[PDB]
Amino acid sequence: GKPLVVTTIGMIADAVKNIAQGDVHLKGLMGPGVDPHLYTATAGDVEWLGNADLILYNGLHLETKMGEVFSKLRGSRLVVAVSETIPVSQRLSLEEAEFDPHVWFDVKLWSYSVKAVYESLCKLLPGKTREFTQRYQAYQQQLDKLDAYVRRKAQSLPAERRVLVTAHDAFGYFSRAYGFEVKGLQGVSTASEASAHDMQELAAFIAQRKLPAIFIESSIPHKNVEALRDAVQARGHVVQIGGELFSDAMGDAGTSEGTYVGMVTHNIDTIVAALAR
């Protein structure tokens, strides 16, 4: 029977689906509304993993709480942190201590991680190199159009309006790639809430710059941004939750949002939409 590939964040699973297609049995460990940061492999999870022939994960310390489980299952099977194949050079850092793991927001730099997925699948199923290659190229072409679109789209938004404030610091590369003044109620990690002082500042910041909209996120308790929204309100500005954005998690399987391409299309759409005019 076909080999078991097991991935964490849906983004990888998407790359797998497009490349391996039905040539593998795929299990997306982290689904919609799932925060990889504070995610733990449940009983079933660590088991699916236990039988996986190929394990795929971000790297760049995204899935913070999986190191033990991985470093452990590594060596016994194929374990690959797809994104750590990004020339460190291109990975944004945080206080030089951290490495922004949200690289799937720079479509052009995500081609690396997708490349990793593709090449892992080939390593897993050598005989499937031809079909995993051509499909791959295709899927990349989709990425390319996607990166293009997100830039075009971003361009549709006057530089000043490109100030995006979201649930957590998960769009650094998005900012660096398509030019957006980004800010997040939570840091690059949700393993630390936002200090009252922090929300306060952000609230006024949004009220000072008068942001037409701030955004929620599928993987982080909305209760936090809506609170910022009120703090902004209590500051003389009614900011709209310009839409729910996909940070670390994708939409539901079977939906256009449930794919990298669509997930990101939803993002830029929702954002610029909620930010222009």
Side-chain angles (χ1 to χ4, degrees):
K2 328 182 284 265
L4 180 59
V5 169
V6 167
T7 87
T8 47
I9 57 171
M11 283 82 86
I12 298 196
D14 186 72
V16 165
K17 292 208 251 242
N18 290 287
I19 302 157
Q21 317 248 124
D23 297 314
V24 311
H25 278 111
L26 155 62
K27 164 88 213 245
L29 281 196
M30 326 177 147
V34 166
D35 183 337
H37 307 303
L38 325 137
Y39 188 94
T40 341
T42 69
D45 298 306
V46 158
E47 145 169 3
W48 286 86
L49 276 175
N51 326 307
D53 304 312
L54 167 67
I55 286 172
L56 287 182
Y57 68 115
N58 215 39
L60 303 197
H61 188 57
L62 175 79
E63 299 99 336
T64 62
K65 279 126 182 33
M66 281 195 143
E68 222 89 46
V69 221
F70 282 151
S71 88
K72 287 162 156 45
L73 252 85
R74 304 190 55 131
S76 324
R77 69 212 41 232
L78 274 178
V79 171
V80 163
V82 301
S83 321
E84 309 243 66
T85 66
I86 271 138
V88 159
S89 66
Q90 269 155 123
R91 343 172 163 184
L92 304 184
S93 178
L94 284 94
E95 237 54 289
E96 302 93 271
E98 214 77 6
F99 258 150
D100 195 9
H102 309 85
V103 297
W104 55 79
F105 272 141
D106 183 342
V107 181
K108 223 233 252 206
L109 177 89
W110 178 242
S111 353
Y112 278 87
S113 304
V114 166
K115 194 225 223 123
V117 178
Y118 152 72
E119 278 176 356
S120 266
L121 292 181
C122 287
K123 265 27 162 140
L124 181 67
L125 310 182
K128 232 40 139 219
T129 290
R130 202 211 303 306
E131 37 269 89
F132 280 178
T133 282
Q134 166 243 113
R135 286 184 193 137
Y136 164 42
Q137 301 161 183
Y139 184 57
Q140 241 322 109
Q141 312 240 10
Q142 278 174 70
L143 279 237
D144 288 354
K145 260 165 252 20
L146 179 43
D147 179 272
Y149 174 92
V150 177
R151 203 168 232 116
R152 166 173 30 187
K153 262 284 183 160
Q155 257 333 305
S156 76
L157 217 75
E160 302 78 20
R161 301 217 152 243
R162 288 179 208 145
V163 177
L164 159 86
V165 175
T166 40
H168 84 300
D169 230 0
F171 296 92
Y173 297 69
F174 174 83
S175 89
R176 172 176 98 168
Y178 321 92
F180 276 100
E181 169 133 337
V182 295
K183 294 262 188 2
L185 202 62
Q186 268 211 80
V188 72
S189 180
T190 29
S192 321
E193 310 285 330
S195 98
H197 133 288
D198 286 303
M199 172 172 304
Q200 228 67 259
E201 312 199 284
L202 193 48
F205 160 68
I206 298 155
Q208 251 126 209
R209 316 282 308 287
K210 273 106 206 254
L211 299 207
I214 47 163
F215 302 67
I216 19 170
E217 282 183 18
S218 20
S219 35
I220 281 106
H222 293 214
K223 125 215 296 325
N224 288 288
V225 154
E226 305 212 326
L228 162 45
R229 207 264 332 304
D230 302 342
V232 184
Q233 232 108 143
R235 300 253 205 203
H237 177 50
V238 198
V239 64
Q240 260 194 309
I241 261 64
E244 209 195 359
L245 304 188
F246 289 109
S247 22
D248 321 317
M250 285 200 320
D252 299 309
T255 74
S256 22
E257 262 82 12
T259 72
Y260 178 62
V261 155
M263 157 230 213
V264 176
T265 289
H266 154 94
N267 272 12
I268 211 70
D269 282 20
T270 291
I271 292 172
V272 297
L275 280 199
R277 45 156 69 204

Short mmCIF file of all heavy atoms in Angstrom, two decimals, residues 126-180:
data_model
loop_
_atom_site.label_atom_id
_atom_site.label_comp_id
_atom_site.label_asym_id
_atom_site.label_seq_id
_atom_site.Cartn_x
_atom_site.Cartn_y
_atom_site.Cartn_z
N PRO A 126 10.88 7.09 -4.76
CA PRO A 126 11.81 7.29 -5.87
C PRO A 126 11.17 7.04 -7.23
O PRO A 126 11.37 7.80 -8.17
CB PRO A 126 12.94 6.29 -5.58
CG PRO A 126 12.35 5.31 -4.60
CD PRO A 126 11.43 6.16 -3.77
N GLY A 127 10.40 5.96 -7.31
CA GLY A 127 9.75 5.61 -8.55
C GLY A 127 8.71 6.64 -8.96
O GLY A 127 8.27 6.65 -10.10
N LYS A 128 8.32 7.51 -8.03
CA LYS A 128 7.32 8.53 -8.33
C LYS A 128 7.92 9.89 -8.66
O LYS A 128 7.20 10.89 -8.67
CB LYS A 128 6.34 8.66 -7.15
CG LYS A 128 4.88 8.57 -7.54
CD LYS A 128 4.64 7.49 -8.59
CE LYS A 128 3.38 6.69 -8.32
NZ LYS A 128 3.58 5.24 -8.63
N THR A 129 9.22 9.92 -8.95
CA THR A 129 9.93 11.17 -9.26
C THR A 129 9.37 11.96 -10.45
O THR A 129 9.24 13.19 -10.37
CB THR A 129 11.42 10.90 -9.54
OG1 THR A 129 12.08 10.54 -8.33
CG2 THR A 129 12.09 12.14 -10.11
N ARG A 130 9.04 11.28 -11.54
CA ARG A 130 8.50 11.94 -12.72
C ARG A 130 7.18 12.67 -12.46
O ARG A 130 7.03 13.85 -12.76
CB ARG A 130 8.32 10.93 -13.85
CG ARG A 130 8.29 11.57 -15.22
CD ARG A 130 7.41 10.78 -16.17
NE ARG A 130 7.85 9.40 -16.28
CZ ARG A 130 9.09 9.04 -16.60
NH1 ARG A 130 10.01 9.96 -16.82
NH2 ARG A 130 9.41 7.75 -16.69
N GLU A 131 6.22 11.95 -11.90
CA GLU A 131 4.92 12.53 -11.61
C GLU A 131 4.98 13.49 -10.43
O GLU A 131 4.19 14.42 -10.34
CB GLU A 131 3.89 11.43 -11.34
CG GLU A 131 4.42 10.24 -10.57
CD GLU A 131 4.95 9.16 -11.48
OE1 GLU A 131 6.15 9.21 -11.83
OE2 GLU A 131 4.17 8.25 -11.84
N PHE A 132 5.92 13.26 -9.51
CA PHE A 132 6.06 14.14 -8.35
C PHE A 132 6.83 15.37 -8.75
O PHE A 132 6.81 16.38 -8.05
CB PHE A 132 6.80 13.43 -7.23
CG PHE A 132 5.94 12.50 -6.43
CD1 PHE A 132 6.49 11.76 -5.38
CD2 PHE A 132 4.59 12.36 -6.71
CE1 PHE A 132 5.71 10.90 -4.64
CE2 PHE A 132 3.80 11.49 -5.98
CZ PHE A 132 4.36 10.76 -4.94
N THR A 133 7.51 15.28 -9.89
CA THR A 133 8.29 16.40 -10.39
C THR A 133 7.43 17.33 -11.19
O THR A 133 7.34 18.52 -10.90
CB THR A 133 9.45 15.92 -11.28
OG1 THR A 133 10.50 15.41 -10.46
CG2 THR A 133 9.98 17.07 -12.12
N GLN A 134 6.81 16.80 -12.23
CA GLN A 134 5.97 17.64 -13.06
C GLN A 134 4.87 18.31 -12.22
O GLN A 134 4.70 19.53 -12.29
CB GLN A 134 5.37 16.81 -14.18
CG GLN A 134 4.26 17.50 -14.87
CD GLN A 134 2.97 16.74 -14.71
OE1 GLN A 134 2.05 17.20 -14.06
NE2 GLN A 134 2.91 15.55 -15.31
N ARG A 135 4.15 17.53 -11.43
CA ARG A 135 3.10 18.08 -10.58
C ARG A 135 3.75 19.21 -9.79
O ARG A 135 3.23 20.32 -9.73
CB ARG A 135 2.59 17.04 -9.59
CG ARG A 135 1.71 15.96 -10.18
CD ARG A 135 1.21 15.06 -9.07
NE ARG A 135 0.61 13.82 -9.53
CZ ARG A 135 0.83 12.63 -8.97
NH1 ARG A 135 1.65 12.54 -7.93
NH2 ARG A 135 0.24 11.54 -9.44
N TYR A 136 4.88 18.89 -9.18
CA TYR A 136 5.62 19.86 -8.39
C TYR A 136 5.73 21.17 -9.14
O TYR A 136 5.23 22.19 -8.68
CB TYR A 136 7.00 19.31 -8.08
CG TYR A 136 7.98 20.34 -7.61
CD1 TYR A 136 7.61 21.33 -6.70
CD2 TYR A 136 9.30 20.32 -8.06
CE1 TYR A 136 8.52 22.28 -6.24
CE2 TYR A 136 10.23 21.26 -7.61
CZ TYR A 136 9.84 22.24 -6.70
OH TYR A 136 10.76 23.15 -6.24
N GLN A 137 6.38 21.14 -10.30
CA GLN A 137 6.55 22.35 -11.11
C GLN A 137 5.23 23.07 -11.20
O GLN A 137 5.14 24.28 -10.95
CB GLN A 137 7.02 22.00 -12.51
CG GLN A 137 8.33 21.27 -12.54
CD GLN A 137 8.54 20.56 -13.85
OE1 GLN A 137 9.53 19.85 -14.03
NE2 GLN A 137 7.61 20.74 -14.78
N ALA A 138 4.19 22.34 -11.57
CA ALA A 138 2.87 22.92 -11.68
C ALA A 138 2.65 23.69 -10.39
O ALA A 138 2.67 24.92 -10.38
CB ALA A 138 1.83 21.84 -11.85
N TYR A 139 2.46 22.95 -9.29
CA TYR A 139 2.23 23.56 -7.98
C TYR A 139 3.09 24.80 -7.70
O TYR A 139 2.68 25.71 -6.99
CB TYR A 139 2.41 22.51 -6.88
CG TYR A 139 2.09 23.02 -5.49
CD1 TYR A 139 0.84 23.56 -5.19
CD2 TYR A 139 3.03 22.93 -4.47
CE1 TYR A 139 0.53 23.99 -3.89
CE2 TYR A 139 2.74 23.35 -3.18
CZ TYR A 139 1.50 23.88 -2.90
OH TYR A 139 1.23 24.27 -1.61
N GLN A 140 4.30 24.83 -8.25
CA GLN A 140 5.17 25.98 -8.03
C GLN A 140 4.63 27.13 -8.86
O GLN A 140 4.59 28.27 -8.40
CB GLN A 140 6.61 25.66 -8.43
CG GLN A 140 7.62 25.78 -7.28
CD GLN A 140 7.33 26.94 -6.34
OE1 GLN A 140 6.91 26.74 -5.20
NE2 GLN A 140 7.54 28.16 -6.82
N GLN A 141 4.23 26.83 -10.09
CA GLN A 141 3.69 27.83 -10.98
C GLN A 141 2.51 28.51 -10.30
O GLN A 141 2.26 29.70 -10.51
CB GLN A 141 3.22 27.18 -12.27
CG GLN A 141 4.23 26.24 -12.84
CD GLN A 141 4.66 26.67 -14.22
OE1 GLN A 141 4.32 27.76 -14.67
NE2 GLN A 141 5.39 25.81 -14.91
N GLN A 142 1.78 27.75 -9.50
CA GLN A 142 0.64 28.28 -8.76
C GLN A 142 1.20 29.24 -7.72
O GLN A 142 0.66 30.32 -7.51
CB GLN A 142 -0.13 27.14 -8.07
CG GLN A 142 -1.11 26.39 -8.98
CD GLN A 142 -1.75 25.18 -8.29
OE1 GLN A 142 -2.57 25.33 -7.38
NE2 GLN A 142 -1.37 23.98 -8.73
N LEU A 143 2.29 28.83 -7.08
CA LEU A 143 2.94 29.66 -6.07
C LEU A 143 3.33 30.98 -6.71
O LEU A 143 3.00 32.06 -6.21
CB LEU A 143 4.20 28.96 -5.54
CG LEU A 143 4.04 27.88 -4.47
CD1 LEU A 143 4.86 28.26 -3.24
CD2 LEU A 143 2.57 27.70 -4.11
N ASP A 144 4.04 30.89 -7.83
CA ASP A 144 4.48 32.06 -8.57
C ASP A 144 3.33 33.03 -8.83
O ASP A 144 3.40 34.21 -8.47
CB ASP A 144 5.14 31.61 -9.88
CG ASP A 144 6.49 30.96 -9.66
OD1 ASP A 144 6.96 30.97 -8.50
OD2 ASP A 144 7.09 30.45 -10.63
N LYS A 145 2.27 32.55 -9.46
CA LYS A 145 1.13 33.41 -9.72
C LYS A 145 0.68 34.00 -8.39
O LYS A 145 0.36 35.18 -8.30
CB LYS A 145 -0.01 32.62 -10.35
CG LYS A 145 -0.13 32.77 -11.86
CD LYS A 145 -1.04 31.69 -12.45
CE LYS A 145 -0.26 30.63 -13.23
NZ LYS A 145 1.19 30.60 -12.87
N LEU A 146 0.69 33.17 -7.34
CA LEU A 146 0.26 33.60 -6.01
C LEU A 146 1.13 34.73 -5.47
O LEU A 146 0.62 35.74 -4.97
CB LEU A 146 0.28 32.43 -5.02
CG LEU A 146 -0.12 32.73 -3.56
CD1 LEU A 146 -1.34 33.63 -3.52
CD2 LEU A 146 -0.41 31.43 -2.83
N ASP A 147 2.44 34.56 -5.55
CA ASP A 147 3.32 35.59 -5.06
C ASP A 147 3.09 36.86 -5.87
O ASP A 147 3.08 37.97 -5.33
CB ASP A 147 4.78 35.17 -5.19
CG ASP A 147 5.72 36.24 -4.72
OD1 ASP A 147 6.08 37.10 -5.56
OD2 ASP A 147 6.08 36.24 -3.53
N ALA A 148 2.92 36.70 -7.17
CA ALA A 148 2.70 37.84 -8.05
C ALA A 148 1.45 38.57 -7.63
O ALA A 148 1.48 39.77 -7.36
CB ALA A 148 2.57 37.36 -9.49
N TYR A 149 0.35 37.82 -7.55
CA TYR A 149 -0.95 38.34 -7.17
C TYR A 149 -0.89 39.11 -5.86
O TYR A 149 -1.36 40.24 -5.78
CB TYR A 149 -1.94 37.17 -7.07
CG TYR A 149 -3.32 37.51 -6.55
CD1 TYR A 149 -4.36 37.84 -7.42
CD2 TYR A 149 -3.61 37.43 -5.18
CE1 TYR A 149 -5.65 38.08 -6.95
CE2 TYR A 149 -4.89 37.67 -4.70
CZ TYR A 149 -5.91 37.99 -5.59
OH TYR A 149 -7.18 38.20 -5.13
N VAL A 150 -0.31 38.50 -4.84
CA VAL A 150 -0.20 39.13 -3.53
C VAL A 150 0.60 40.42 -3.58
O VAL A 150 0.41 41.31 -2.75
CB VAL A 150 0.44 38.19 -2.50
CG1 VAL A 150 0.60 38.90 -1.16
CG2 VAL A 150 -0.42 36.94 -2.33
N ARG A 151 1.52 40.52 -4.53
CA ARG A 151 2.29 41.74 -4.65
C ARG A 151 1.43 42.75 -5.40
O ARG A 151 1.25 43.88 -4.94
CB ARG A 151 3.60 41.51 -5.41
CG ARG A 151 4.66 42.57 -5.08
CD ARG A 151 6.05 42.19 -5.59
NE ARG A 151 7.07 42.27 -4.55
CZ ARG A 151 7.75 41.22 -4.10
NH1 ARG A 151 7.53 40.01 -4.60
NH2 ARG A 151 8.66 41.38 -3.15
N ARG A 152 0.88 42.33 -6.54
CA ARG A 152 0.01 43.20 -7.31
C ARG A 152 -1.00 43.75 -6.32
O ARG A 152 -1.04 44.95 -6.06
CB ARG A 152 -0.71 42.40 -8.40
CG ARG A 152 -1.90 43.12 -9.05
CD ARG A 152 -2.46 42.32 -10.23
NE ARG A 152 -2.28 40.88 -10.05
CZ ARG A 152 -2.55 39.97 -10.97
NH1 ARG A 152 -3.01 40.33 -12.16
NH2 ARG A 152 -2.37 38.69 -10.71
N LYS A 153 -1.80 42.85 -5.76
CA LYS A 153 -2.82 43.19 -4.77
C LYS A 153 -2.30 44.19 -3.74
O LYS A 153 -2.87 45.27 -3.57
CB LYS A 153 -3.29 41.92 -4.06
CG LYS A 153 -4.57 41.36 -4.62
CD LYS A 153 -5.76 42.18 -4.15
CE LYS A 153 -7.06 41.59 -4.65
NZ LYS A 153 -8.22 42.07 -3.84
N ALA A 154 -1.21 43.84 -3.07
CA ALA A 154 -0.64 44.73 -2.07
C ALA A 154 -0.43 46.11 -2.68
O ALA A 154 -0.71 47.13 -2.05
CB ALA A 154 0.68 44.17 -1.56
N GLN A 155 0.04 46.13 -3.92
CA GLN A 155 0.31 47.38 -4.65
C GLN A 155 -0.96 48.21 -4.79
O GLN A 155 -0.91 49.43 -4.87
CB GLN A 155 0.88 47.08 -6.05
CG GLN A 155 2.38 47.28 -6.19
CD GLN A 155 2.94 48.30 -5.22
OE1 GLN A 155 2.48 49.44 -5.17
NE2 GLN A 155 3.93 47.89 -4.44
N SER A 156 -2.10 47.53 -4.84
CA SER A 156 -3.37 48.21 -4.98
C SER A 156 -3.65 49.07 -3.76
O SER A 156 -4.50 49.96 -3.78
CB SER A 156 -4.49 47.19 -5.17
OG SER A 156 -4.82 46.57 -3.94
N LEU A 157 -2.92 48.81 -2.67
CA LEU A 157 -3.12 49.56 -1.44
C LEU A 157 -2.07 50.62 -1.21
O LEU A 157 -0.91 50.30 -0.98
CB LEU A 157 -3.13 48.62 -0.24
CG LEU A 157 -4.13 49.03 0.83
CD1 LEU A 157 -5.52 48.67 0.35
CD2 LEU A 157 -3.80 48.34 2.15
N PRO A 158 -2.46 51.90 -1.27
CA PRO A 158 -1.51 52.99 -1.05
C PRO A 158 -0.60 52.65 0.13
O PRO A 158 -1.05 52.07 1.12
CB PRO A 158 -2.40 54.19 -0.78
CG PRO A 158 -3.64 53.90 -1.56
CD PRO A 158 -3.82 52.40 -1.55
N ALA A 159 0.68 52.99 0.02
CA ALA A 159 1.67 52.68 1.05
C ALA A 159 1.22 52.94 2.49
O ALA A 159 1.48 52.12 3.37
CB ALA A 159 2.97 53.44 0.78
N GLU A 160 0.55 54.06 2.71
CA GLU A 160 0.07 54.41 4.05
C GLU A 160 -0.96 53.43 4.60
O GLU A 160 -0.94 53.10 5.79
CB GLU A 160 -0.54 55.82 4.05
CG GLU A 160 0.42 56.90 3.59
CD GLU A 160 0.59 56.93 2.09
OE1 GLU A 160 -0.29 56.38 1.39
OE2 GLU A 160 1.59 57.50 1.60
N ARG A 161 -1.85 52.97 3.73
CA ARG A 161 -2.90 52.03 4.10
C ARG A 161 -2.38 50.61 4.34
O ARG A 161 -3.08 49.76 4.89
CB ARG A 161 -3.98 51.99 3.01
CG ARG A 161 -4.64 53.34 2.73
CD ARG A 161 -6.14 53.20 2.43
NE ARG A 161 -6.91 54.39 2.80
CZ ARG A 161 -7.87 54.41 3.73
NH1 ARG A 161 -8.18 53.29 4.38
NH2 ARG A 161 -8.51 55.54 4.00
N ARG A 162 -1.13 50.36 3.94
CA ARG A 162 -0.53 49.04 4.09
C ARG A 162 -0.09 48.71 5.52
O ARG A 162 0.72 47.82 5.73
CB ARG A 162 0.66 48.92 3.15
CG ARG A 162 0.30 48.79 1.68
CD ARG A 162 1.56 48.69 0.83
NE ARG A 162 1.40 49.20 -0.53
CZ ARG A 162 2.35 49.84 -1.21
NH1 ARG A 162 3.54 50.07 -0.66
NH2 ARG A 162 2.10 50.26 -2.45
N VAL A 163 -0.61 49.43 6.50
CA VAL A 163 -0.25 49.17 7.89
C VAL A 163 -1.21 48.10 8.41
O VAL A 163 -2.39 48.38 8.63
CB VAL A 163 -0.41 50.42 8.77
CG1 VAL A 163 -0.11 50.08 10.22
CG2 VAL A 163 0.50 51.53 8.28
N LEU A 164 -0.73 46.88 8.59
CA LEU A 164 -1.59 45.81 9.08
C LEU A 164 -1.31 45.38 10.51
O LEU A 164 -0.18 45.07 10.88
CB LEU A 164 -1.51 44.59 8.15
CG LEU A 164 -1.92 43.21 8.70
CD1 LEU A 164 -3.42 42.99 8.56
CD2 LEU A 164 -1.15 42.15 7.93
N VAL A 165 -2.36 45.38 11.33
CA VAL A 165 -2.24 44.97 12.71
C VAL A 165 -3.11 43.72 12.82
O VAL A 165 -4.28 43.73 12.44
CB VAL A 165 -2.74 46.07 13.68
CG1 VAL A 165 -2.72 45.55 15.10
CG2 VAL A 165 -1.86 47.31 13.56
N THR A 166 -2.52 42.64 13.32
CA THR A 166 -3.23 41.38 13.43
C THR A 166 -3.09 40.73 14.80
O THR A 166 -2.39 41.24 15.68
CB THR A 166 -2.72 40.40 12.39
OG1 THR A 166 -1.30 40.52 12.30
CG2 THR A 166 -3.34 40.69 11.03
N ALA A 167 -3.75 39.59 14.97
CA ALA A 167 -3.73 38.81 16.21
C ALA A 167 -2.32 38.61 16.79
O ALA A 167 -2.09 38.92 17.97
CB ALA A 167 -4.40 37.46 15.98
N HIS A 168 -1.39 38.08 15.99
CA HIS A 168 -0.01 37.86 16.43
C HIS A 168 1.03 38.13 15.33
O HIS A 168 0.70 38.16 14.15
CB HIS A 168 0.15 36.45 17.06
CG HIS A 168 0.39 35.34 16.07
ND1 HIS A 168 -0.50 35.03 15.07
CD2 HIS A 168 1.38 34.42 15.99
CE1 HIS A 168 -0.07 33.97 14.41
NE2 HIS A 168 1.06 33.58 14.95
N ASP A 169 2.29 38.34 15.74
CA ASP A 169 3.41 38.64 14.83
C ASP A 169 3.71 37.52 13.86
O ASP A 169 4.78 36.90 13.92
CB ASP A 169 4.67 38.95 15.65
CG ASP A 169 5.36 40.25 15.22
OD1 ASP A 169 4.85 40.92 14.29
OD2 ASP A 169 6.40 40.59 15.83
N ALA A 170 2.80 37.28 12.93
CA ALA A 170 2.95 36.21 11.97
C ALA A 170 2.96 36.68 10.52
O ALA A 170 2.55 35.94 9.64
CB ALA A 170 1.85 35.18 12.17
N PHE A 171 3.41 37.89 10.27
CA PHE A 171 3.42 38.36 8.89
C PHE A 171 4.66 39.16 8.57
O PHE A 171 4.67 39.94 7.63
CB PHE A 171 2.17 39.19 8.60
CG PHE A 171 0.89 38.42 8.71
CD1 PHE A 171 0.19 38.36 9.91
CD2 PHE A 171 0.37 37.75 7.61
CE1 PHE A 171 -1.01 37.66 10.02
CE2 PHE A 171 -0.83 37.04 7.71
CZ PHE A 171 -1.52 37.00 8.91
N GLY A 172 5.70 38.96 9.36
CA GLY A 172 6.95 39.67 9.13
C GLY A 172 7.42 39.57 7.69
O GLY A 172 7.71 40.59 7.05
N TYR A 173 7.52 38.34 7.17
CA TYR A 173 7.95 38.13 5.79
C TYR A 173 6.89 38.71 4.86
O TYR A 173 7.20 39.21 3.78
CB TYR A 173 8.13 36.65 5.48
CG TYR A 173 9.21 35.98 6.29
CD1 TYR A 173 9.06 35.79 7.66
CD2 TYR A 173 10.34 35.46 5.67
CE1 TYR A 173 10.00 35.08 8.38
CE2 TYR A 173 11.29 34.75 6.40
CZ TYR A 173 11.11 34.56 7.76
OH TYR A 173 12.01 33.84 8.51
N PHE A 174 5.63 38.62 5.27
CA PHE A 174 4.55 39.16 4.47
C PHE A 174 4.81 40.66 4.30
O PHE A 174 4.64 41.22 3.22
CB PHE A 174 3.20 38.92 5.16
CG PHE A 174 2.03 39.56 4.47
CD1 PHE A 174 1.40 38.93 3.40
CD2 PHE A 174 1.56 40.81 4.89
CE1 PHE A 174 0.33 39.53 2.75
CE2 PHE A 174 0.49 41.42 4.25
CZ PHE A 174 -0.13 40.78 3.18
N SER A 175 5.24 41.29 5.39
CA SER A 175 5.53 42.71 5.37
C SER A 175 6.76 42.96 4.51
O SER A 175 6.73 43.81 3.61
CB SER A 175 5.78 43.22 6.80
OG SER A 175 7.14 43.11 7.18
N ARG A 176 7.83 42.21 4.76
CA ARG A 176 9.07 42.37 4.02
C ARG A 176 8.91 42.08 2.53
O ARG A 176 9.55 42.72 1.70
CB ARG A 176 10.14 41.44 4.60
CG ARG A 176 11.42 41.36 3.79
CD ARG A 176 12.46 40.51 4.48
NE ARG A 176 12.48 39.15 3.95
CZ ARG A 176 13.43 38.25 4.21
NH1 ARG A 176 14.45 38.56 4.99
NH2 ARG A 176 13.36 37.04 3.67
N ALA A 177 8.02 41.15 2.20
CA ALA A 177 7.79 40.74 0.82
C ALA A 177 6.93 41.68 -0.01
O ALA A 177 7.33 42.09 -1.10
CB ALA A 177 7.18 39.35 0.78
N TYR A 178 5.76 42.02 0.51
CA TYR A 178 4.83 42.87 -0.22
C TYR A 178 4.61 44.27 0.36
O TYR A 178 3.68 44.98 -0.05
CB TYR A 178 3.51 42.12 -0.35
CG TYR A 178 3.75 40.64 -0.62
CD1 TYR A 178 3.81 39.72 0.43
CD2 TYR A 178 3.98 40.18 -1.92
CE1 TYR A 178 4.10 38.38 0.19
CE2 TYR A 178 4.28 38.84 -2.16
CZ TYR A 178 4.34 37.95 -1.11
OH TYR A 178 4.65 36.63 -1.35
N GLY A 179 5.48 44.67 1.29
CA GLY A 179 5.39 46.00 1.89
C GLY A 179 4.14 46.33 2.70
O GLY A 179 3.18 46.89 2.18
N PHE A 180 4.17 45.98 3.98
CA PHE A 180 3.05 46.25 4.87
C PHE A 180 3.61 46.55 6.26
O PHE A 180 4.49 45.85 6.77
CB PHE A 180 2.13 45.02 4.95
CG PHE A 180 1.11 44.94 3.85
CD1 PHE A 180 1.31 44.10 2.76
CD2 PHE A 180 -0.07 45.67 3.91
CE1 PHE A 180 0.35 43.98 1.75
CE2 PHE A 180 -1.04 45.56 2.91
CZ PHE A 180 -0.83 44.71 1.83
#
